[PDB]
Amino acid sequence: IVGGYTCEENSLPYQVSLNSGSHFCGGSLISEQWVVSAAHCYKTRIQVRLGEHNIKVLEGNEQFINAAKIIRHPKYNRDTLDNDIMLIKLSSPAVINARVSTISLPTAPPAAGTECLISGWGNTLSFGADYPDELKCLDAPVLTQAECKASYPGKITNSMFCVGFLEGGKDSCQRDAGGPVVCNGQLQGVVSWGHGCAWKNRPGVYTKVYNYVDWIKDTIAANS
Amino acid sequence: RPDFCLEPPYTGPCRAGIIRYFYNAKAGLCQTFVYGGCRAKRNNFKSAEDCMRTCGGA
Ligand SMILES: [Ca+2]
């Protein structure tokens, strides 16, 4: 996250870290045994880290659970980036408590102008590599689909929407992918892609979680 | 070594952070970089050995 601030400790109890060697993507806890992330975060083995704030230091609220099943959306296209969403089933249920809990799936997609919260342990610089120990947060508005398409002509599919700023300096970045965009108490987006991070006129592009509510509920049922 | 060995490393637009190798022609060796997870260019290898086999150095 570029141009954000350190989140209050464990104030985003649905935020997870995906770890393979080290932190490489985020995710969102949506049930006791299921996490939503991005399809381009796929690896064959992933350890999910819940209850984290500082990912380099033991704080005592963490739960580390290996993925038992990892399921990419069947229409994910790795060249257009269409349908960039994935589900991870935990090998055991997460313990739900004050510092680890679920985020609601959305009942309607978010209106342009809605203020949302984007979070992750991704790069904090638009140039360079400053990967933070502590979880970062960014308050940012949903853009109109027209402005989103104008910013990235020809590239915005029906699975995508933009959140952020055209003036530059505030955005998600590498190692934020798969993590949450939360608006009005609902998980509305998955961090996906952009041209650079926080560049002028190039806002963040996110997967529209609302479009996958049925796919998520049915996939959970079929694997549970 | 192929022409694409001389191209700069390419993180690309996706926002994962996946460790990959590229040939750094200035240093004469394969080095690591952070790959975003999609739209890789050709100077992008999953191991140092793959990079050295194709592009040399070291
Ligand atoms: Ca920790």
**Residue A115 among known ligand-binding residues:** no
3-state secondary structure of A35: strand
Distance from CA of B34 to the nearest CA of A (A): 8
Radius of gyration of chain A (CA): 16
Q: How far apart are CA A100 and CA A14, in angstroms?
A: 6
Residue showing tokens 């989103």? A148
Beta carbons within 10 angstroms of residue A5's beta carbon: 10
How would you write chain A as a 3-class SS string? CECCEECCCCCCCCEEEEEECEEEEEEEEEECCEEEECHHHCCCCCEEEECCCECCCCCCCCEEEEEEEEEECCCCCCCCCCCCCEEEEECCCCCCECCECCCECCCCCCCCCCEEEEEECCCCCCCCCCCCCECEEEEEEECCHHHHHHHCCCCCCCCEEEECCCCCCCECCCCCCCCEEEECCEEEEEEEECCCCCCCCCCEEEEEHHHHHHHHHHHHHHCC
**Residue A167 among known ligand-binding residues:** no
In this structure, CATH architecture of domain B1-58: Irregular (4.10)
> Domain map of chain A by residue range?
1-12+103-210, 13-102+211-223
Supply A64's token pair: 């580390």
Q: Are A53 and A10 in contact (CB under 8 A)?
A: yes
**Looking at the complex, does the CB of residue B37 fall below 8 Å from at least one CB of chain A?**
yes
**Sign of the alpha-carbon torsion through A110, A80, B11, A121:** positive
Q: Which residues of A touch B36 (CB under 8 A)?
A: 40, 174, 177, 193
Say how many residues make up chain B. 58
Q: What are phi and psi of A210, to 5 degrees?
A: -55, -35
Task: Using alpha carbons, select from A105, A93, A99 the residue that is nearest to residue A36.
Answer: A105
**Residue A52 among known ligand-binding residues:** yes
**Sign of the alpha-carbon torsion through B34, A36, A161, A115:** negative
Q: Are A120 and A182 in contact (CB under 8 A)?
A: no
CATH number of A1-12+103-210: 2.40.10.10
Q: Which residues of B touch A177 (CB under 8 A)?
A: 14-16, 36-37
Distance from CA of B1 to the nearest CA of A (A): 27
Cα A57 to ligand 1 centroid, rounded to whole Å: 4
Task: Using alpha carbons, select from A28, A65, A29, A62 the residue that is nearest to residue A45.
Answer: A65
Task: Using alpha carbons, select from A88, A28, A117, A79 the residue that is nearest to residue A193.
Answer: A79
Q: Are A98 and A12 in contact (CB under 8 A)?
A: no
Mutate to test the interface with B, among A79, A193, A195 (most CBs of B within 10 A): A193
> Domain map of chain B by residue range?
1-58
**Cα-Cα-Cα-Cα dihedral of B34, A198, A130, A102, to 10°?**
-90
Distance from CA of B19 to the nearest CA of A (A): 9
Distance from CA of A158 to the nearest CA of B (A): 18
User: Quick one: which H or E segment has residue A182?
Assistant: strand A180-183
**Residue A54 among known ligand-binding residues:** yes
Report the CATH fold assignment for A13-102+211-223. Answer: Thrombin, subunit H (2.40.10)
Task: Using alpha carbons, select from A123, A113, A120, A118 the residue that is nearest to residue A197.
Answer: A123
Answer yes or no: same fold for A1-12+103-210 and A13-102+211-223. Answer: yes
For residue B42, CA distances in Å to A6, A71, B37, B45, B56 come to 37, 27, 14, 8, 14
What approach was used to elucidate this structure?
X-ray
Q: What is the resolution of this structure in A?
A: 1.6
Supply B11's token pair: 């993180």
Interface of A with B (CB under 8 A): 21, 23-25, 38, 40-41, 78-79, 81, 122-123, 129, 131, 172-178, 191-195, 197
Q: Which of A23, A131, A191 sits opposite B15 (nearest CB)?
A: A191
Q: Are A121 and A14 in contact (CB under 8 A)?
A: no
Mutate to test the interface with A, among B10, B15, B39 (most CBs of A within 10 A): B15
